[PDB]
């Protein structure tokens, strides 16, 4: 339609300027001792659930690839 064109234009405009929106990487202790709102804004997801999800997904992939052949 027309609105989707505007949304895609905005998305492309702010996706070309990408690599500037990212915050610097920080250790957990440095993230902890920040202003109250900034340490929610800038704290990334914990690493343990990411590894658990990756392990489950890889287990499924390995099971499929070993069962097919």
């Amino acid at each position: 339609s027309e609105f989707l064109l505007r949304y895609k234009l905005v998305w492309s405009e702010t996706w070309k300027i990408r690599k500037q929106l990212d915050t610097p990487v920080r250790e957990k202790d440095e993230n902890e001792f920040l202003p109250a709102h900034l340490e929610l804004i800038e704290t990334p997801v914990s690493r343990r659930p990411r590894l658990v999800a990756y392990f489950i997904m890889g287990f499924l992939v390995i099971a499929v690839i070993l069962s097919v052949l």
């Binding site: 709102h37 929610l40 804004i41 800038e42 997801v45 659930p49 658990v52 999800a53 287990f59 499924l60």
Partner: peptide
Amino acid sequence: VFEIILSGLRTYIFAHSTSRIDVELGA
């Protein structure tokens, strides 16, 4: 069991990611 754990993890990660957006909006 793996599907249940994965769904819970996805919900947790999505909520964690959107909380930062709403905090930024509020500030």
